[PDB]
Amino acid sequence: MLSFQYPDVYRDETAIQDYHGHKVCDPYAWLEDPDSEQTKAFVEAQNKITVPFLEQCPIRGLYKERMTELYDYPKYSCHFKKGKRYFYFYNTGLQNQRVLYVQDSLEGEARVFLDPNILSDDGTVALRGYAFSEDGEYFAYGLSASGSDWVTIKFMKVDGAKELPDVLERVKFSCMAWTHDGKGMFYNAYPQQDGKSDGTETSTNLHQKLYYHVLGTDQSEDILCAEFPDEPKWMGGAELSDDGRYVLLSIREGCDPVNRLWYCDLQQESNGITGILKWVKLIDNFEGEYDYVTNEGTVFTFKTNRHSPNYRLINIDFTDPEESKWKVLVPEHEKDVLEWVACVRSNFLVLCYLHDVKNTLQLHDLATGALLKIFPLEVGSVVGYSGQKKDTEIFYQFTSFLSPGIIYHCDLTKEELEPRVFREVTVKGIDASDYQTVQIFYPSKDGTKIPMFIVHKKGIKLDGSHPAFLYGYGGFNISITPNYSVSRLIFVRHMGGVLAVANIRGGGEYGETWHKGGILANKQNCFDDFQCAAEYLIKEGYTSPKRLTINGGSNGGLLVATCANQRPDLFGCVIAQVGVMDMLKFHKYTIGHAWTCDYGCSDSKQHFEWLIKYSPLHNVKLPEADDIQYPSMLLLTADHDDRVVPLHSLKFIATLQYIVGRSRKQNNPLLIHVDTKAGHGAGKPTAKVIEEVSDMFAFIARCLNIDWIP
């Protein structure tokens, strides 16, 4: 098949670093500089071979045409109310960015409120965060360009959708919260730094501070309200209590699901917000997570994991704050994870649980925590919710593997609560009834039972003949729950494929114990779990190694790259998106310091010894057996991915092509595609999403020689 040559790539054989006596050579360290002529030429040369490979075969166009047809369906978010108006997001089908609409009543005619598509023709300027004033009359929103995490905050008056002059720069990883007097808004920003701040730099992000912006002033006038000069990794996010009386500051240091919780009683400020607030350090350690739900006077309800790995609700009275005095409002469940909680209609709580990787939704009494109502759902996920304390209704959106899903509405003023379908769209071209979703539990190496969803055409024979696409993430307490993907359903229907999603350890599916089971010294459990998922699909006859593709992104990109090194015999194709590949250096760049809770950090001798065993960049090795080569691999990244800097994928592909690609037995391609004007993924325009899925499935089809099934 391979009718191209890999690019010349210089090896700096002098690049050696000692880690606690262990010498590590890094011959492609120069690819860490995105701005050099050398790195730019590398990217150019790699794209020059990848693009013709992906575009050459007619199946890419067949896939793209079908994706363009099938993805063209109306896409709505839940309605939410702010002040006297309702809002929702809506994409007519193929707009690059969804549009924010407003109406003056649920009966009322909608109009465009914010349309990001007119901000850039290629749709690479996207909304990233927003906050309405308490009265709903003013609106702040973040914009990111080219997929960067950097944000510019802009402002509008809601009535008439009027642009205001206020602009806030240097915003990243920011909360936004208006004080209820309508004077101004809390937000986070970083200090000025040398070099670029556009998403193409690798500079580490430290010393984030909390500011207050008074509407109608220049950013230079903003008040510094909190800073942590002795703790450069701390990040303090502010929110207002539901009654507007207290600023609650949640301080985090990295990815650990824990936070400090400080508060400021605004009534006690000497003269309004004029400098560092009189913070009361209610919870002044990183031992537990405390997520504000609501308060009634000084009694504050928090969702917490403090000695409760599946989470629970507690009340802390600010007048009697010692731990032995806290009240348990809704105890921890033995198995089900309490995912989130909202307070609505003054004295209702909405609780969303995860029960064996499917969501349930119920209403509880605020005063006692008693269960009041179960909202019936099919098997799938709750992916949207609206309803705050002053609201008298909820909206929530359900989705699953086989249907775009349903938006429900429930009027909570009625004696008998009757949720009703509010919006439901069906995708013509896909008949959900032709397919089924099953959940199985398979044993990992150490015997732990791991959940997996499998989606396939009804009545297939389990004879190993089918292409399969196995997805995993496995980290950061993230649960991978059912979601709707037209792109994956085209693989099922038009490529005869089987979809699988493995809920491996490191995730949040079974609470904090599931997370801890796949981090730090136990990170290898993630990889073992995922390899065991592949073995299950093979043994049970869904697929065979030569027909199996694995995919993951970010921490999931690390997952599939590691699995390619550890078990190249198990996979036909590997697609690693925006992956962390250099586990010895990840903490040096942008926000990578925040991932040490899951990975550790190479500065520690103990951690180095875990990391070096699985780091993809440091474990590329020719398979011993003459009859085994590496799977076909495709790495996808982009030049403004400032979440996972692209050097990770650049150095990894250079290493793959040199160590493995040069071998005579290697006939499967090892390729990278580096996109422009894009980043880690959030906010990617529809046009780019379509190109990306078309590339992925064309790669699979070509490498595995799969015929299109029209």
Swiss-Prot record:
The subcellular localization recorded is: Cytoplasm
The record, for PROSITE patterns, names: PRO_ENDOPEP_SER (PS00708)
N6-acetyllysine is carried by which residues?
Answer: 157
One of the GO BP terms on file:
proteolysis
Pfam families xrefs:
Peptidase_S9 (PF00326), Peptidase_S9_N (PF02897)
Domain of life according to the entry = Eukaryota
Family from the record: Belongs to the peptidase S9A family.
Query: Can you name this protein?
Result: Prolyl endopeptidase
Organism, scientific name? Sus scrofa
Q: Which gene encodes it?
A: PREP
